[PDB]
Amino acid sequence: KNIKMGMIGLGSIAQKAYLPILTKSERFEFVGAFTPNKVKREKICSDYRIMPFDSIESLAKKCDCIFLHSSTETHYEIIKILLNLGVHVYVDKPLASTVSQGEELIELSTKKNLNLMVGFNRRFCPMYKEIKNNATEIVSINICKHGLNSLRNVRFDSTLIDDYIHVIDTALWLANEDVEISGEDLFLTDNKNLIFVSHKLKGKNFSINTSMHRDSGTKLEQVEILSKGKIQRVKNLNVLEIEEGGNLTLKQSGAWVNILKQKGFEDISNHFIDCIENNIKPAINGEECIKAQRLLEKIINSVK
Amino acid sequence: KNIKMGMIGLGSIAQKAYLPILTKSERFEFVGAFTPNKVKREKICSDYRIMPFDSIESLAKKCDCIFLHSSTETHYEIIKILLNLGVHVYVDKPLASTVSQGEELIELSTKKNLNLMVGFNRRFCPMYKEIKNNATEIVSINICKHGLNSLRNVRFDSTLIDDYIHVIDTALWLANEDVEISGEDLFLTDNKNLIFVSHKLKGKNFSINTSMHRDSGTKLEQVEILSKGKIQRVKNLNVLEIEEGGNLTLKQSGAWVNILKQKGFEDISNHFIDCIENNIKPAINGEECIKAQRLLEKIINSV
Amino acid sequence: KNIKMGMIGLGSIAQKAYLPILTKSERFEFVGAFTPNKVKREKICSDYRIMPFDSIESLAKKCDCIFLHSSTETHYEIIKILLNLGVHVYVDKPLASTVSQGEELIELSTKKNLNLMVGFNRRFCPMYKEIKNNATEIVSINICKHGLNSLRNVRFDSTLIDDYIHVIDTALWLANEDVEISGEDLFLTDNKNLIFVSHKLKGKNFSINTSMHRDSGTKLEQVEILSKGKIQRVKNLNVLEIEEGGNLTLKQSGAWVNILKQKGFEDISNHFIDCIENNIKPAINGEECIKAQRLLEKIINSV
Amino acid sequence: KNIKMGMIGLGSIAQKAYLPILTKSERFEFVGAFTPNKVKREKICSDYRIMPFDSIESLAKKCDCIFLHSSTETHYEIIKILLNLGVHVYVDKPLASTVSQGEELIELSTKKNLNLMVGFNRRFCPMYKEIKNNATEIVSINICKHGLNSLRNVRFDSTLIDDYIHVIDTALWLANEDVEISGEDLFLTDNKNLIFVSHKLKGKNFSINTSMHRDSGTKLEQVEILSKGKIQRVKNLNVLEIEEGGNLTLKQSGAWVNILKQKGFEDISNHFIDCIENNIKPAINGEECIKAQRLLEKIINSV
Ligand SMILES: [Cl-]
Ligand SMILES: [Cl-]
Ligand SMILES: [Cl-]
Ligand SMILES: [Cl-]
Ligand SMILES: [Cl-]
Ligand SMILES: [Cl-]
Ligand SMILES: [Cl-]
Ligand SMILES: [Cl-]
Ligand SMILES: [Cl-]
Ligand SMILES: [Cl-]
Ligand SMILES: [Cl-]
Ligand SMILES: [Cl-]
Ligand SMILES: [Cl-]
């Protein structure tokens, strides 16, 4: 086929969120894959009948684009190599360890006329798109993402950039207007691990209330939009509730809608490829790749 | 019995929230009732076999205490008459139209050694008390009270002290620590009617996010408490949800639990009577009667 | 007032399901009440400012109608006394200990030109009426009534005619067509206490599956109607669910709808009085009073 | 690897329910696939980097086992060919168009020492297994499978064998004791298409109520087990509800549990392979492959 794709990084995220969709290779040729651990590389590639490659460079030279699912700290150096070898790059969030590094990569991509897209899957979550499209005259939005036994020994800034970024990015995508921080809770363990974080993001027309508790009673995600005559909620990316006219209407995801379709991974990955096919840029480009991260760096830097 | 009770105001609130409880008069004598419309007064009194009285003063002279369910604007003048006649008073929120008037009434009640209690029923809502009792190491609380087609043709300030006051009072009762306003949204119609209001009330240990949308998709009230290892929610004062260990547990109010018991009206009314019997003040006394309203006046003054 | 009403039997059901309605005596004069236990009689009457009476007969002579809430075995001779004294009678289910005794009472009421009504409140449950009214082209109905720790040390037949009768009556009311019983499950303890009962009631156009588990994991009731393009459910008489077009829509009872209104007690009691006022027979009259009981007698006799 | 697997039939079921799991070929070599339409064959094989084969026979000769996802009417002829070529066979339900044919195929598999397994995935549904394993002293089971706009332009017997068979198979698996039909509803269109079917299956200890409405308000599947002190329900194979001690606990499938794991397809497919690896017959073999179909044939013949 026209488009040749490779994958770099065959870790748990690649295995559960990307491989299951991309290995049904309908709109591209799956040229090969690389991961540093040779044993794991050969086993995964064998399972899917994909050609294993011995390096980032050898794979990139045979591809038009790469799905990169490596650790955040390796993004900057790997993406610089890939862009210089002329391949489009899809990478999991965040783009790079710092926004400054991200800005450098963005400029390199535009110089090379290549798409550098960050995997904010929630922007492609079908039910999130539905409530966004159907909301008019919004008065408030609430977004939360809580975890069960999710309290670990990593500094809070890592957790913010790695996970809270999804909450902030979804907020900014829904706001579709400039916002300012008007409230913050940030609770840390004695050893500086994240317990709870919350913000109020104020826009001209409404505010967004974002919240993440790492030591909650369940793993939950919810977006709730309050608008004229209506409440819309999407729970765990896959149940849609609408309160209107004094009734609560509940819609489930279809019985045969796979979980990657539900969460937006299917559509975001296919969109990345489609944009290459049609010589256009995905909406997640440029400042869109780093605006949530920029806000988080400001929050992180305000911590005395 | 030892305690003689009378009721002033026999309108919708009295009929739905108080009379269904107080007319089964187990702990007091229901001496009589008054409301200005004579036909309505005699009809409601006849319905319940209660003696109708022709004035506030005539009724008060025969009672030890009065349940007052009149319009907010009439609270100040009526309560002054009642306290000066030596009767304890229970009144629906808010105490009076202004905090100043409330302060005056509180002072008068202290001078006369009488109980003046404001009807913040949510502090006696059984499920609210349950979640408050069982939460430890709280990180956040969210409280909302939304309405369907509930835009009112009155200035926003009236709607805040009449209705949002429940949200604010419940927040302060749950906080059990000082709080500061750290965020606000106040959206009004062109005629200055309330559409939406929200605040963040920040305490040292956690914050409370409050909200009220008057033009929502349903009538709903919810308190949600996020604490270490747990989420607790009470919906419409009568369904309790707990999320713990990755599962959700749902408890309904018992099949024969009456709605006034569910909402706290039964317990708050009984508590008022019990405090008279025991010669003590209810917890909703003094500054507790007006602390939520004080916060609302700061909001109103800022517009 | 034109209509004089009295109440006989002031037990737990009278206290929770009838007195809270009837003591707001809008459409009738509450003349008095009698119950065999004098101490209880006087306490309850004092609480509601009702006149206590010394006997069934002394009360009946001062009334046009009586709400009777006595034990099933006492219904027959009491009702005979009341109808012979010219009083309309509302009674809790079942009418009498046996269907042939009920048939006699019905004929006596006819001879005396009086109404004799049995308290099948579910026929007046607002949400049950709503789903009945909106269902067309029904293919199946499921009705269940389960209890938590509801095993009682009484013979199964008593539980069937005192509680399962509500399930059967609701089924027959929803069927509105002849049905034939089949597919019986009847599980009893060694001591012959009811554990579980179920039936399939087959009509020409659809069947109704009825069940009742007395040692379940919760107290619940549900009516579910499957029809063309639709599922309707009412849970615990107060939540209405509709599945149509691939969506579930849930409607709760209004925030101020009292539980007796929810369950049909309010409307059934008011219906009894209205029918007296307008000189007509209530919905539940004649064979409607005993049709469910007749089916249960056939069931009990087949064991 | 040791086990060589091929797939015959690359239609909608293969694509949604099998290929997504089997193409991650961890425990076998995916040797190739065949489907009659060459264009579709080459597209799907290209998508997954699998070798396309031009016939059933050429593929079978290179495999140890075959997953067969062809139309019911072709099962008998294809399965005879495969068993005679020495390949183990996994096929979607039902085994063949008739029980006579199925019995022949089973006997043929025994003669050739090969496994012939029918794809009753619900027996491997994790939540179904959980409730089955946790139920004791069952008093009743209800199973339904309803559809939205699911009326099919085929005779009812086809729909019973193709779809209601899941309901009946799950019932017999949960019963684990002999049952007798104690009730039946069967409603058809003028052209003899299935609208609604229901049965009561009576066992010594409890009954199972099965139903399927093809013109309902939503697509729904539910298994509910009533037992001593407990109600357990599994909805759409992926939400578990337990009612116990008067409260309802709800457990969702894990956020990263894929839908084929949820529905039992993953586990049934892996079990088929594991049994080949261990020289054992899988759970669903012999009479288990046709037990549900046998009951349906009796139902169909009784019409
Ligand atoms: Cl690796
Ligand atoms: Cl689907
Ligand atoms: Cl976008
Ligand atoms: Cl008045
Ligand atoms: Cl109760
Ligand atoms: Cl009530
Ligand atoms: Cl008594
Ligand atoms: Cl209401
Ligand atoms: Cl009727
Ligand atoms: Cl084909
Ligand atoms: Cl279980
Ligand atoms: Cl998971
Ligand atoms: Cl999936």
CA distance A218 to A213: 10
Distance in angstroms (rounded) separating the CA atoms of residues C126 and C123: 8
Residue B212: CA count within 13 A, CB half-sphere: 21
Residue B249 CA to residue D249 CA, distance in Å, equals 4
Distance from the A177 Cα atom to the nearest Cα atom in chain D, whole angstroms: 31
B246 contacts D248? CB cut-off 8 A: no
Q: How far apart are CA A121 and CA A124, in angstroms?
A: 5
- Distance (Å, rounded) from C-alpha B136 to C-alpha B138? 5
Counting Cα atoms < 13 Å in the Cβ hemisphere of B75 gives 28
Verify whether the Cβ–Cβ distance B139 to A213 is below 8 Å: yes
Instruction: Round to whole Å and give the CA distance between B248 and A217.
Output: 9
Handedness of CA B98, B101, B107, B112 (dihedral sign): negative
Residue with tokens 């920040």: B202
Task: Tell if the CB–CB gap between C207 and D198 is shorter than 8 Å.
Answer: yes
CA angle C236, C297, C70 (to 5 degrees): 65
Q: Using CB atoms within 10 A of its CB, is residue A53 exposed (0-12), middle (13-18) or buried (19+)?
A: buried
Judging contacts by C-beta atoms under 8 Å, the chain B residues touching residue D249 are 247-250
Nearest CA in chain C to D148: C246
3-state helix, strand, coil in chain B (%, to 5): 40, 30, 30
Which residues from chain A sit within 8 angstroms of residue B203, using beta carbons?
none
Q: Which tokens in the block code for residue C124? A: 């007046």
Q: Which of D160, D165, D157 is nearest to D121 (CA)?
A: D165
Give the 3-state DSSP-derived string for chain C, with helices as H, strands as E and coil as C. CCCEEEEECCCHHHHHHHHHHHCCCCCCEEEEEECCCHHHHHHHHHHHCCCECCCHHHHHCCCCEEEECCCHHHHHHHHHHHHHCCCEEEECCCCCCCHHHHHHHHHHHHHCCCCEEECCHHHHCHHHHHHHHHCCCEEEEEEEEECECCCCCCCHHHHHHHHHHHHHHHHHHHHCCCCEEEEEEEEECCCCCEEEEEEEEECCCCEEEEEEECCECCCEEEEEEEECCEEEEEECCCEEEEEECCEEEEEECCCCCCHHHHHCHHHHHHHHHHHHHCCCCCCCCHHHHCHHHHHHHHHHHHC
Closest CA to C278 of C98, C121, C32, C88: C88
In 3-state terms chain A splits into helix, strand, coil percentages (rounded to 5) of 40, 25, 35
Q: Judging by beta carbons within 10 Å of its beta carbon (0-12, 13-18, 19+), is residue B246 exposed, middle or buried?
A: middle
| C274, C260 contact by CB (below 8 A) | no
Instruction: Give strand pairing partners of C281.
Output: none
Question: Cα(A246)–Cα(A267) distance, rounded to whole angstroms?
Answer: 34
Looking at the DSSP bridge assignments, the partners of residue B188 are B194
Find how far residue B209's CA is from the centre of its chain.
Answer: 19
Q: Chain C interface, mutation test: which of D200, D221, D249, most C Cβ atoms within 10 Å?
A: D200
Sheet arrangement for strand C29-34: C29-34, C4-8, C65-68, C88-91, C116-118
Encoded tokens for C207: 């069947």
**Helix boundaries (H) for chain D:** 12-13, 19-22, 38-48, 56-60, 75-84, 99-111, 126-134, 156-159, 165-175, 259-263, 265-277, 291-302
Tokens coding B119: 């009807």
Q: Which ligand is nearest to the CA of D9?
A: 10
Q: Work out the number of other CB atoms within 10 angstroms of the CB of residue B154.
A: 13
**Cα–Cα distances in angstroms (integers) from residue C148 to residues A75, B154, C210, in the given order:** 59, 49, 18
D88: phi > 0 → left, psi -120 to 50 → alpha, else beta; which?
beta
What would you measure as the largest C-alpha separation in chain D, in angstroms? 61
Q: Do D183 and C183 touch (CB under 8 A)?
A: yes
Q: Could you tell me if C255 and B219 are in contact, meaning their C-beta atoms sit under 8 angstroms apart?
A: yes
Closest chain D C-alpha to A294 CA, distance in angstroms: 29
Q: Which residues pair with D234 in a beta bridge?
A: D223, D240
Q: Which amino acid is at D228?
A: K
Main-chain dihedrals φ then ψ at residue C191, nearest 5 degrees: -80, 10
CB under 8 A, 24+ apart: contacts of C40-43: C40/C10, C41/C10
Tokens of B20: 């269904």
Give the minimum alpha-carbon distance from B3 to chain C in angstroms, rounded to a whole number: 14
Solved using: X-ray
Both tokens assigned to B40: 């309505």
Residues 6 or more apart whose Cβ sits within 8 Å of residue B103: B290
- A 10 A CB-CB count for A277 gives 13
Of A16, A24, A26, nearest to D256 by CB-CB distance is A16
CA D135–ligand 5 middle distance (angstroms)? 27
| Shortest distance, CA D264 to any CA of chain B (angstroms) | 22
CA distance B93 to B72: 8
Residues 6+ apart with CB under 8 A from D252: A236, D238, D239, D240
Size of interface C-D (CB pairs under 8 A): 106
Q: Between β-strands A230-235 and A220-227, what pairing exists: parallel, antiparallel or unpaired?
A: antiparallel
**Phi first, then psi: what are they for C5, rounded to 5°?**
-120, 145
Tokens of D2: 């040791």
Distance D17 CA to ligand 2 centre (A): 12
Burial C234-256 (b: 16+ CB within 10 A, else e): bbbbbbbbbbbeebbbbbbbeee
Buried b (16+ CB within 10 A) or exposed e, B285-297: beebbbebbebbb
Q: For residue B112, count CB atoms less than 10 angstroms from its CB and return exposed for 0-12, middle for 13-18, buried for 19 or more.
A: middle
Q: Do residues C197 and C160 make contact, with C-beta atoms less than 8 angstroms apart?
A: yes
| Residue A91: other Cβ atoms inside 10 A | 25
Q: Which residues in C lie closer than 8 A to residue B48 (C-beta atoms)?
A: 23-25, 49
- Which residue in B116, B117, B129, B115 sits closest to B170, CA to CA? B129
Vertex C36 angle, CA C31 and C40, to 5°:
80
Interface membership of B150 toward C (CB under 8 Å): no
Q: What residue of A is the nearest CA neighbor of D29?
A: A47
Cα A115 off chain centre by: 16
Cα separations in angstroms, C199 against B136, C20, C217? 49, 35, 21
Q: List phi, psi (to 5°) of B181.
A: -70, 120
Give the C-alpha separation, A193 to C177, whole Å.
68
Query: Is B279 exposed, middle or buried (CB count within 10 Å of its CB: 0-12, 13-18, 19+)?
Result: exposed
Contacts of D87 (CB under 8 A, 6+ apart): D6, D60, D63, D64, D65, D66, D114
For residues B197 and B212, is the Cβ–Cβ distance under 8 A? yes
Cα–Cα distances (Å) from D262 to C161, D122, D259, in that order, read 44, 10, 5
Q: Which helix (H) or strand (E) is A78 found in, with range?
A: helix A75-84
C249–A247 CB contact, under 8 Å = yes
Residue of D nearest to B250 (CA): D248
In C, minimum Cα distance to B31 occurs at C49
Cβ within 8 Å, pair A250-C246: no
Phi and psi dihedrals of D14, rounded to 5? -55, -45
d(CA A48, CA A45): 5
231-290 in chain C: CB under 8 A from chain B: 236, 252, 255-259
Taking residue A113's Cβ as centre, other Cβ atoms within 10 Å add up to 10
Please tell me the distance between residue D218's alpha carbon and the centre of ligand 2 in angstroms: 12
Torsion angle, CA of A253/A257/A259/A265, rounded to 10 degrees? Answer: -110
How many angstroms separate the CA atoms of B222 and A8, rounded?
Answer: 47
- Give the torsion through C-alpha atoms of C101, C103, C107, C112, to 10 deg: 50
Cα–ligand 1 centroid distance for A50 (angstroms): 16
Token readout for D230 is 């407990």
Site of tokens 């119609």: B189
Identity of the residue numbered C132:
K
Q: C247, A248: Cβ pair inside 8 Å?
A: no
A165 C-alpha to center of ligand 1: Å?
25
Residue of B nearest to C49 (CA): B49
User: Are the Cβ atoms of D48 and A23 closer than 8 angstroms?
Assistant: yes
Exposed / middle / buried, residue D97 (Cβ in 10 Å: 0-12, 13-18, 19+): middle
Judged by CB atoms closer than 8 Å, whether chains meet at A250 and C247 is answered as: yes
Contact B244 A139 (CB under 8 A): no
Helices in D145-187 by DSSP H: which ranges?
A: 156-159, 165-175
Q: Is the peptide bond between D94 and the residue preceding it cis, with omega within 30 degrees of 0?
A: yes
Which residues does residue D65 pair with via DSSP β-bridges, in sequence order? D5, D88
CA–CA separation, A200 vs B182, rounded Å? Answer: 10
What is the spatial distance between Cα A131 and Cα A223, in angstroms, rounded to a whole number? 9
Instruction: Please tell me whether residue A243 adopts helix, strand or coil conformation.
Output: strand
Angle, alpha carbons B24-B29-B31 (nearest 5°):
110
Residues of C in contact with A248 (CB under 8 A): 249-251
Q: Are strands B180-188 and B239-244 parallel, antiparallel or unpaired?
A: unpaired
**Contact criterion met (CB below 8 Å) for D152 and D199:** no
Both structure tokens of B63:
């009672």
Give the count of beta carbons closer than 10 Å to the beta carbon of residue D104: 16
* Helix spans in D151-279 (H): 156-159, 165-175, 259-263, 265-277
Measure the CA–CA gap between D12 and C36, rounded to whole angstroms. 74
Contact A197, A185 (CB under 8 A): yes
- Residue C13: partners with Cβ closer than 8 Å, 6 or more residues away: C69, C92
Longest dimension (CA), chain B: 61
Helix (H), strand (E), coil (C) string for A57-76: HHHHCCCCEEEECCCHHHHH
**Cβ <8 Å between B23 and C48:** yes
CA of A128 to the centre of ligand 12 (A): 21
Rounded CA gap, A68 and A105, in Å?
14
**Rounded alpha-carbon distances, angstroms, from residue B35 to A141, B70, B80, B204, C25:** 44, 9, 17, 47, 19
Q: How far is it, in rounded angstroms, from Cα D20 to Cα A259?
A: 12
CA distance A257 to chain C (A): 15
Beta bridge partners of residue C65, listed in sequence order: C5, C88
> Checking DSSP bridges between strand B194-202 and strand B207-213, what pairing results, if any?
antiparallel
SS3 label, residue B92: coil
- DSSP state letters, D23-79: TS-SSSEEEEEE-S-HHHHHHHHHHHTPPB-SSHHHHHTT-SEEEE---GGGHHHHH
How is residue A47 written in tokens? 């399972």
Contact A115, A272 (CB under 8 A): yes
Residue list, CB under 5 A from ion ligand 7: C 35-37
Nearest by CB to residue C255, choosing from B219, B252, B255, is: B219
The answer to whether C59 and C6 have CB atoms below 8 angstroms apart is: yes
**What residues form DSSP beta bridges with A65?**
A5, A88
Quick one: which ligand is closest to B71's CA? 4
The Å distance, Cα D24 to ligand 12 centre, comes to: 19
Q: What tokens does D238 get?
A: 């992926």
What domains sit in chain D, N to C, each tagged with a CATH number? Answer: 1-119 (3.40.50.720), 120-303 (3.30.360.10)
Residue B210, min C-alpha distance to chain A (Å) = 11
Please, what sign has the CA dihedral across residues C256, C261, C267, C270?
Answer: negative
d(CA C180, CA D71): 41
Long-range contacts of A154-158 (CB under 8 A, 24+ apart): A154/A193, A155/A192, A155/A193, A156/A186, A156/A188, A156/A192, A156/A193, A156/A194, A156/A197, A156/A303, A157/A300
Q: Which of D24, D8, D269 is CA-nearest to residue A23?
A: D24
Retrieve residue C111's tokens.
Answer: 């001879």
Q: Residue D55 class from Cβ within 10 Å (0-12 exposed, 13-18 middle, 19+ buried)?
A: exposed
Asked if D249 lies within 8 A of B247 by C-beta distance, the reply is yes
CA pair distance D145, D164, nearest whole angstrom: 8
Q: Which two tokens stand for residue C160?
A: 């069937």
Spatial distance between the Cα atoms of B230 and B227, rounded to a whole number of angstroms: 5
Residues 6+ apart with CB under 8 A from C132: C173, C174
Q: How far apart are CA B15 and CA B5, in angstroms?
A: 16
Residue D28 CA: distances (Å) to CA of A6, D63, D270: 24, 10, 10
Q: State the Cα–Cα distance between residues D267 and D261, nearest whole angstrom.
A: 7
Supply φ then ψ for residue A285, to 5 degrees: -150, 160
